[PDB]
């Protein structure tokens, strides 16, 4: 679970179910399990909110390659079903702590960022800062090339 604190470990949920159901199968310290999954009205609810965890934190982690993603292949890369993904979209999207944009006009929509509606600002940042990096290139090009030419 500590490893889960990066990349979300978008793992087959049943595998983690093994990893945390064999806690109840501990021939050692098992009171951890009973505090976690020896419970029913909350321990099984802990499994449920763990599904919540995997889906919503995967929504978090996967925010990079977006602007093109399908409702079906969403579930395919979600370790959970499509209408399961439908309810997950629904709750995370009415919660809307992030701003995505989606529509079943195609179903190929995504847990997006503002979807880049911006003017030159994008171009501005890009051109300016990149060109600046290039002047930096030059200004250390002279330096380091001279340095490697010191002995000569």
């Amino acid at each position: 679970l500590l490893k889960l604190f990066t990349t979300m470990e978008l793992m087959r949920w049943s595998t983690l179910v093994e990893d945390y159901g064999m806690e109840l199968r501990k021939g050692s310290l098992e009171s951890p399990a009973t505090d976690v999954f020896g419970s029913t009205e909350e321990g099984e609810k802990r499994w449920k909110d763990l599904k919540n965890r995997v889906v919503e934190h995967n929504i978090r982690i996967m925010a990079k390659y977006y602007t093109r993603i399908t409702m079906k292949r969403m579930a395919q890369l979600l370790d959970l079903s499509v209408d399961e993904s439908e309810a997950f979209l629904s709750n995370l999207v009415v919660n809307k702590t992030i701003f995505a944009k989606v529509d079943r006009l195609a179903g190929i929509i995504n847990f997006q960022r503002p979807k880049d509606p911006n003017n030159l600002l994008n171009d501005w940042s890009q051109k300016l800062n990149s060109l600046m990096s290039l002047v930096n290139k030059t200004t250390h090009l002279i330096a380091k090339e001279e340095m490697i030419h010191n002995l000569q």
Binding site: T6, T7, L10, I61, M62, K64, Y65, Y66, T67, R68, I69, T70, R73, Q76, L77, I108, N110
Partner: protein, 93 residues
């Protein structure tokens, strides 16, 4: 390939990388954890998009034959500098 089509299809990946369609996503999210390439991979066409990368170690034949980019840059940005200045020549003033 220096060339474009940097919205590459997954096909060369799944052929020569001995990986599957369900694992190209892990192939590049583990590379997001690595941090040498951070593509904006397409997932409506399943295309594995190419952004900035960490290039090589040494291409000494291309350290010699980078002239087709370096001298390209030098004489062509020089020539087009001369062309911009040559069209705005006599407002030297």
């Amino acid at each position: 390939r220096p060339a474009n089509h940097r919205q590459l299809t997954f096909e060369e990946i799944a052929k020569s990388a001995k990986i599957t369609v369900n694992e190209v996503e892990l192939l590049v999210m583990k590379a997001l954890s690595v941090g040498l390439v951070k593509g904006s991979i397409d997932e409506v066409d399943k295309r594995v998009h190419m952004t900035w990368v960490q290039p090589r170690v040494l291409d000494l034949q291309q350290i010699k034959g980078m002239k087709d980019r370096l001298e390209f840059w030098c004489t062509d940005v020089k020539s087009m500098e001369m062309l911009v200045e040559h069209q705005a020549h006599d407002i030297l003033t």
